[PDB]
């Protein structure tokens, strides 16, 4: 679990969005596993606007932060799950690191701010949904 809170927006994994997220929907994209909903309170986070390929992510299944080298946002095949059919997930970045299904929503940060959130994993890999191209989150 986990979310990014920036301005009057809450960014979550689309497959973990609640009834309240859908009732206050701003934007969602099944191909990216992202959903953004509106909030009444001002958020605590700031978004990176950079091309960093190194950062640190929070892994809830280890209660620890780990440093990672991650690939550029790209179209990657993701096997079928209870949440989606077999498809290409876009804007996904992979890295070597530990992740379990419940780790989705953990934040990946670089020195400039929030880069993305955990969205996929398995096999000693961890995949992050990028949010750096969503410029409208800042206004
Ligand atoms: C070990 N392991 C297996 N599975 C994992 C997982 N879940 C995972 O990849 N998917 C299920 C939830 C939706 C994800 C999507 N974006 O399509 C795909 C996350 C993290 C570690 C995982
Ligand atoms: Zn950066």
Curated annotation (Swiss-Prot):
Residues annotated as the enzyme's active site: 15 (for protease 2a activity), 33 (for protease 2a activity), 104 (for protease 2a activity)
UniProt catalytic activity: Selective cleavage of Tyr-|-Gly bond in the picornavirus polyprotein
Q: Which domain of life is it from?
A: Viruses
Q: Where does Zn(2+) 1 bind?
A: 50, 52, 110, 112
Leader peptide range in chain numbering? none
Q: What does this protein do?
A: Cysteine protease that cleaves viral polyprotein and specific host proteins. It is responsible for the autocatalytic cleavage between the P1 and P2 regions, which is the first cleavage occurring in the polyprotein. Also cleaves the host translation initiation factor EIF4G1, in order to shut down the capped cellular mRNA translation. Inhibits the host nucleus-cytoplasm protein and RNA trafficking by cleaving host members of the nuclear pores. Counteracts stress granule formation probably by antagonizing its assembly or promoting its dissassembly.
Subunit record text: Homodimer.
Identify this protein by name: Protease 2A
Specify the species. Coxsackievirus A16 (strain G-10)
Q: Which residues of the full protein are shown?
A: 869 to 1007 of 2193
């Amino acid at each position: 679990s986990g979310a990014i809170y920036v301005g009057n927006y809450r960014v979550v994994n689309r497959h973990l969005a609640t009834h309240n997220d859908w009732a206050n929907l701003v934007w969602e994209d099944s191909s990216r596993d992202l959903l953004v909903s509106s909030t009444t309170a001002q958020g605590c986070d700031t978004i990176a606007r950079c091309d960093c390929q190194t950062g640190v992510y929070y892994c809830s299944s280890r209660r620890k932060h780990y440093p990672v080298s991650f690939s550029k946002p790209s179209l990657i095949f993701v096997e079928a799950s209870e949440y989606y059919p077999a498809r290409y997930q876009s804007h996904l970045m992979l890295a070597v690191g530990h992740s379990e299904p419940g780790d989705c929503g953990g934040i990946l940060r670089c020195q400039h701010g929030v880069v993305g959130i955990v969205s996929t994993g398995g096999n000693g890999l961890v995949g992050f949904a990028d949010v750096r191209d969503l410029l409208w989150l800042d206004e």
